[PDB]
Every structure is written in C-alpha cells, then in structure tokens.
Design a protein around this ligand. Structure first.
Ligand code: HEM
Ligand SMILES: O=c1cc(-c2ccccc2)oc2c1ccc1ccccc12
Length: 480
C-alpha cells in the first residue's frame, strides 16, 4: 500500500469504524486547527474508514496547491457533490483534466468581459462598477424607507437582494427576474446548499447515513433541484432573445462560444457543459459576496469606532461632493484593510472546497496516494498564532502600512480566503471590487448600529460559507 522506503503522513489515534469523526464536531475547522497544532502542517485523519489529508500552514499549502499544483487539482468523488446541479459543475465535478481546464478559462473570460473589463456603452467604468453603483444607491433608498417605517431591518436580507441583482444582471441581463419569488426564495436560502456541501460532512463518509431520513439532506436535494430548474428556465428564456451580433451578458457570451465550438485536447466540448457554467458563476458569486457584505455590516454594527474611522477617511479623501468610486480604492487604505480583516477574522470560507490528488506523490517527504481526499484549512492559516498578533481580535490596522497610508501588501498575502493554485477563485478580483464599492457608497451616507442593550451574536455557523445568526434589529441613519 505504500512504496518501499517511504512513510505516510502523521495520523492521530482514532476509534474503530468512526475514525476521527467525533473529533470534528460542529466546528471542523476549529478542531482540525487544534489537531494540526499538535501533529503538523501535513497530517491525515480518517472519517469513517476514508483517509483524509489535512493541510494547515501557508508554506505547506503553497507547496501542495501551487508548486505541486497539478498533483493537487482534483475534486474528490463525494456523495453530496453528485447531487449538485447536473452533476457537472465546474466547481464540484470530479473532472480536472483538459475539459475542466478549458471550461474554467471560458467561465473566467466570459465572467471578466461582463464584470471587471470596461463597458463599451460607458465612457469610464467597468460593468461591475455600473451595476454596483446602481444597486448600492437603490439599497440606500430601500434602507431609508425601512427606517422611516418599522425602524429596523435584517442586513443579510437586504444584502441578498442587492447582490442577487448585480450577479443576475451580469449573468442574464434583462432576463433576470428581480421580482421572481422563485429566485428570491432560492437566494434567501442558500444556507440549505452551504450547510450540506461542506468539508467533513458525515454524509460523504458513511454510506449508511444516506438511507436514513435526513431533513438537512432533503433540503439540500430540493434546493439543488429548484436551483437547476430556475437556472435552466432562465437560460432557456434568454436563448429566445439572443443574437450573436449583440452579446450583452455571460449567458450570451457562453452561447456564442459554444456556437463556435470550443475544444479540449482536439475534441469538441458538449454545449451543455459550456452553457451550464453560469450555474457556478451565479451560485458561487451570489452566496460568497452576500455572506462577506453581511459579515462586514455586522462587524461595523459591533465596532462603532472602526465604522467611524472608515467614515472619517471617506470624508477626507472623497469629501461629500461626489460618491466613492473604484478608482478611489488605492486611496481608501482603511476601508481596504477593513475588508481584509472581515475576510481574515470571519474566515467565512473555513476550508477551500475539498481537493483530491491526481496521482501518487510525496509532500514534505510523506507519500500520498492518488485520489486522496484533501482538506485545506484557510481559517487555520488566518488565525495562526505564529502568523498574526492577536488572531482572535478584530483589527483592520494589522494590514495598514507603518504610516497607515496604504495596505501592507506583503502581509495581505498571508491571509488566505480564495484558495491558491489551479483551483483558486475565478471571481476574486470581482468580489474584492464589488465588496469595496458597496461598502464605500453605503457608508458614505449611512451609519449602521443596533440599539443599546440589543445583543449581537457573531459566532459563525459552520458551512461551505459560514453565516452569522440572523439579526433583525440593525438601524441606519444618515449623518451631518
Ligand atoms: C468574498 C468572496 C469570495 C470568496 C471568499 C470566494 C472563495 C472561493 C474559494 C475558497 C474557492 C475554492 C478554491 C479551491 O477549491 O481550492 C472558490 C472557487 C470558486 N469561486 Fe470564489 N469566492 C468568492 C467570490 C466569488 C465570486 C464573486 C464568484 C463568481 C462570480 C466566485 C466563483 C467561484 C467559482 C466558479 C469557483 C470554482 C473554481 C474551480 O473549481 O475551478 N467566487 N472561491
Ligand atoms: O450557494 C452556493 C455556494 C457556492 C460556493 C461555491 C464556491 C465557494 C463558495 C460557495 O456555490 C454554489 C452555491 C449554490 C449553487 C451552486 C451550483 C453550482 C455550483 C456552485 C454553487
């Protein structure tokens, strides 16, 4: 089982049949961070009888995902993943050869065309900035409306709407049904997806579990069926009002490409695997950004001074005679550091999506067989005692330069939330720019808080993306 002369990664003692599952508990990232602090940056655990490699140090993770990237770019064949959309997602499917590579590039390019690349019709900004500006204003209006009435709101719920509007435009243009209760019911409930498609879910390691009545699982299955139906219906409509001489969104750009015949290793890639790329773009893009923006607002509600510093900087740099813009990003050091600290401290992607090895290899001298499931603990990297001052504390200042006039780029680089290597997030820049512009436009006009005495629980709920408990008492007020 192991070649002559080599040894396997360090493995803690485990229970028969169970392996280390009881140790992961409700917060797998916290438990593995402790287990790694004892055994190493490269260890294996066992869930049920399935071996799982856990990587926890930034150096080791870079060695595996970047330098041995081709060995670590696989996705494991998990049960939960078989239930995702059409079983053919770019994110979750097990293919990681030339077809995955070609689909990723087409996804990435189409996404870039309609987001961060400048817009033709426009004279000065990219599509993203145009959509976000519009949606951030309308969000402000919606928030003032709610304050003039019930006098409070749920930040997560209002953020869902705006974010869904932005990514839906990019994906489907005018065909996106902003009013659809079918889509709103879906985007408000991605916790049904995220809670089940997370690292170490017992469903993926003990086949018995899937035969038992399981409401979380049934909700995962129904969410996925409803998600796929909505996406397919929307592309279908789209298809109807589509001309190759006027591509205006991601769906149309993928249609145009599929029509020309994209290939991989000399072979045509089936049209269905090209057009279904908006399923990954919309799913990942909506949920992540909504979670990030909601965590940021909650941080501000719970840290008035930080919120105040952010506001002081916008006044000083932009004034109050115009709204913030993307081109103001390098000059708004403190807001960028706020965002970076929202990412580090929450580590709302505690783990990257699970990886799998594509061939037998050795990592730091340890033998790892082909098709070994691999978990990468981003929360551990981001809370490493040896890597950061007070890991548990929320401090935007830790990312600022000595004179606090810019972001310490070298240190920003040790904060891992978008993966690394062959599988790293294709919407990273897009996400950073959208979160920035949303918060800048927002905070230039509104100050968020919760009434005195009202408690706010900021404990994250474990999942692919970690959510915070719902708080429906937040308030917003303009300010002199
Ligand atoms: C704060 C926001 C975001 C975070 C923290 C984030 C995080 C990540 C992470 C950790 C992965 C997994 C990498 C791996 O498996 O090793 C990933 C992949 C992915 N993300 Fe992002 N993401 C965010 C925003 C976006 C946006 C805005 C989009 C889409 C428009 C998106 C698109 C995707 C896609 C399609 C993949 C799968 C790529 C592949 O499997 O080749 N993400 N992201
Ligand atoms: O909520 C989701 C989060 C995520 C997600 C993906 C990567 C990182 C973080 C969240 O993606 C999806 C979500 C929902 C549906 C999806 C369908 C196909 C592919 C991905 C989907």
């Amino acid at each position: 089982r192991v070649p002559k002369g080599l040894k396997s990664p360090p493995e803690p003692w485990g229970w028969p049949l169970l392996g280390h599952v009881l140790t992961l508990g409700k917060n797998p990232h916290l438990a593995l961070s402790r287990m790694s602090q004892r055994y190493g940056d490269v260890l294996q655990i066992r869930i049920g009888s399935t071996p799982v490699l856990v990587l926890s140090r930034l150096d080791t993770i870079r060695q595996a995902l970047v330098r041995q990237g081709d060995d670590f770019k696989g996705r494991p064949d998990l049960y939960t993943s078989t239930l995702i959309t059409d079983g053919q997602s770019l994110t979750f499917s097990t293919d990681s050869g030339p077809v995955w590579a070609a689909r990723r590039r087409l996804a990435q390019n189409a996404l870039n065309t309609f987001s961060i690349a400048s817009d033709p019709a426009s004279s000065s900004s990219c599509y993203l900035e145009e959509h976000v500006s519009k949606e951030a204003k309308a969000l402000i209006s919606r928030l003032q409306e709610l304050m003039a009435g019930p006098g409070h709101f749920d930040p997560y719920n209002q953020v869902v709407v705006s974010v869904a509007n932005v990514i839906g435009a990019m994906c489907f243009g005018q065909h996106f049904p902003e009013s659809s209760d079918e889509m709103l019911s879906l985007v408000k409930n991605t916790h049904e997806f995220v809670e089940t498609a997370s690292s170490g879910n017992p469903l993926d390691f003990f086949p018995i579990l899937r035969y038992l009545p399981n409401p979380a699982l049934q909700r995962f299955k129904a969410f996925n069926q409803r998600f796929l139906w909505f996406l397919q219906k929307t592309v279908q409509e789209h298809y109807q009002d589509f001309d190759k001489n006027s591509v205006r969104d991601i769906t149309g750009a993928l249609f145009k490409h599929s029509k020309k015949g994209p290939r991989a290793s000399g072979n045509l890639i089936p049209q269905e695997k090209i057009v279904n790329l908006v399923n990954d773009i919309f799913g990942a893009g909506f949920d992540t950004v909504t979670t990030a923006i909601s965590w940021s607002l909650m941080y501000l509600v719970t840290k008035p001074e930080i919120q105040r510093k952010i506001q002081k900087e916008l006044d000083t740099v932009i004034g109050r005679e115009r709204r913030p813009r993307l081109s103001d990003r390098p000059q708004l050091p403190y807001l960028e550091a706020f965002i970076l600290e929202t990412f580090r401290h929450s580590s709302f992607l505690p783990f990257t999506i699970p990886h799998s090895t594509t061939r037998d290899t050795t990592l730091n001298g340890f033998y790892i067989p082909k098709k070994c499931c691999v978990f990468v603990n981003q929360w551990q990297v981001n809370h490493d005692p040896e890597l950061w001052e007070d890991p548990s504390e929320f401090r935007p200042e830790r990312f600022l330069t000595a004179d606090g006039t810019a972001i310490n780029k070298p240190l920003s680089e040790k904060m891992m939330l978008f993966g690394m290597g062959k599988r790293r997030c294709i919407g990273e820049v897009l996400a950073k720019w959208e979160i920035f512009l949303f918060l800048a436009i927002l905070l230039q006009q509104l100050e968020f808080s919760v009434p005195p005495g009202v408690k706010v629980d900021l404990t994250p709920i474990y999942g692919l993306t970690m959510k915070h408990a719902r708080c429906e008492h937040v308030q917003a007020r303009r300010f002199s």
